[PDB]
Structures are given as structure tokens and as C-alpha cells.
Amino acid sequence: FIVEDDESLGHKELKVRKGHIAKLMATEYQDEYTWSSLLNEGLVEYIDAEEEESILIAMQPEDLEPAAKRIRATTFTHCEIHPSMILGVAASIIPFPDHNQSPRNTYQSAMGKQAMGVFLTNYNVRMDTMANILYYPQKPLGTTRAMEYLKFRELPAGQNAIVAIACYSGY
Amino acid sequence: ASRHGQKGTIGITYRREDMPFTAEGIVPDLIINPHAIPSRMTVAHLIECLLSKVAALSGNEGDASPFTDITVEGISKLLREHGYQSRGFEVMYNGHTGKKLMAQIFFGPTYYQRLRHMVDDKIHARARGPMQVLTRQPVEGRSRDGG
């Protein structure tokens, strides 16, 4: 997101606005803004790996924007879109990944590619070497926003089961 | 395995009548040992279990969403007013004898997935099989009935 400096509302604000985002939602539910149509008037910017040596980023769109839960500069030029989009495809499936250890994330991101579920829908047509399809593939009760874009809710990985963290004597 | 690097396998199986069971009769699908919790430091697994339980009760499917502002305190209040214990614990009875267990236990739904490394492709044995040509030794290959 690009952040203009001088606002007639005083302090500092990012240029995009509620009217624009309403127009976006309307375009979505039409089922004629695009991402490109949002580009062509200076609302977002593509930034390579170097201009970060020339710019300044805000986490939230509120973090310094007005002048027992969690513990959380006035020259911002950009604010990032959403901090969860520093992740990758596999790691966007781990629920609450900010709430555990990083090597555990790395293991999970490795193991998830070994999971089985569906993989496509024309699988009744495609001859293939080895295929693995399970019976009753359920979307997960917990979820995050990204896996909506990953179409994961449409093609789930496994089933969800009732667990119990006990030591029932043996095994 | 879970979504947190808790890979593991099935030890043995039980039916319901000797699976442990709670007061409402929700007999669990599977039980894993508590010692996989602290040394693996996998808190988010627990948080997911709690949130998933309250999501299933409310109907509203849950939300993981990494750098948001959802806290376990809010989850706890919501689940308490749905009418269960504020930390997801549960009174539960030894399905052998019906007696109460002493310590209450954790309980809830959680998302798993089934991995491809199945035992039927890894069991292998050989006594006096086929035999290599260049070195006159037992051949390779689990599929090829090797040693």
C-alpha cells in the first residue's frame, strides 16, 4: 500500500479508501475494478528487494497511523497489506503458526506434502502410476484466510477427529 | 500426523466398551500421550483443539489467522458460556470399570491427515531367495524379494 504524506485531515494516511474497497466488493459480487484497475491510479506499488533500502513500512494500517492480551515514527511511506502474507503455500496451512516453535513449522511444512486426500477431480479419468484418494475428506474446523485462496476448503487434506491427550496405560 | 509435526503411528486399537468415555458419551477417536506436549513445545496444537471445540459447538467455523488478535481468554469465555469447562478439561470415566478417573483430561476435536508411509509396503522378509549374477549375493529390492 502506498502512503501519501500530506492529508487535509492533518497527519498522514494511506491513499486507498473505503469507497474504493466498497467498489472492489461490488465488483466481486457482480460475479469492473481489477487489481490492474487499482494499480492505474496509484494505490498499490510493486516493490523489488532493494527499495526496502529506501523505504519505511508499517505493520498495521493503524500501528502509528493515528498520532492482558498481547504486547505490540511518523514518516511512513508504505504499509504492508497483511503480515500473514509473508508465508508460503505449505506454511499457510498451519493453524496459529505464530504460537509454536519454528522448527516444528519446518517439519510440518515438510510432512504436509506427504499427506493424502484428493488431488484433482478428473481422477476417474486420469490413468496414473500411483494415486491416493480417501473416502470422506472433510474441511478443517480450524482454518485461516489463506487456504480459502488455496482452494483448500474445496479439496481438503484429511479428516478431523475427536482426540484426548491422556496416557491410557499402554500404547 | 497433525498440522504441527506430531507424526506418529497407531499402537493398538480398542472398541468403545473399553475406550474411555465422558459423561455425554462422546467416546474419543484417538488418544496420544501427554509427553509429546512440553518438549515439542507445540502450543498451537492445543489452541487449535480448544478453538475447534468451540467452533463446532457454535456452528461458526473457527479461524486461525496468524497475526490476529484472538486470545485464548476470549476463546475460554465463549466456550464457558456454551456450557463446558473454561479450559476444555473434562470429567471422564474408565471404560473398563466405569469408575471415575481422578485427574480430569483434555478433550476435543482436532484436524489430522493420513500419511502415505503405510506398513504394508514396508514389511519385508527373505529366507533363501533369488541370487545376483555378478557377485553371487542376495539381490536388492523389497519388491524384488531382496535381502
Binding site: A22 | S58, G62, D63, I70, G74, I75
Partner: peptide, 20 residues
């Protein structure tokens, strides 16, 4: 303070339906 634990869209769908 409501802390937003789940999802919702269609309230805003009708919100712009009558804001238009």
C-alpha cells in the same frame, strides 16, 4: 471490544446494497 472470532460477509453485501 468484540474480538471477532469467526467470519462474515453478507451483512456488508447488503450494506453496500442499500448504501448504493
Amino acid at each position: 471490544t468484540n474480538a471477532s472470532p469467526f467470519i462474515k460477509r453478507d451483512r456488508m453485501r447488503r450494506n453496500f446494497l442499500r448504501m448504493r
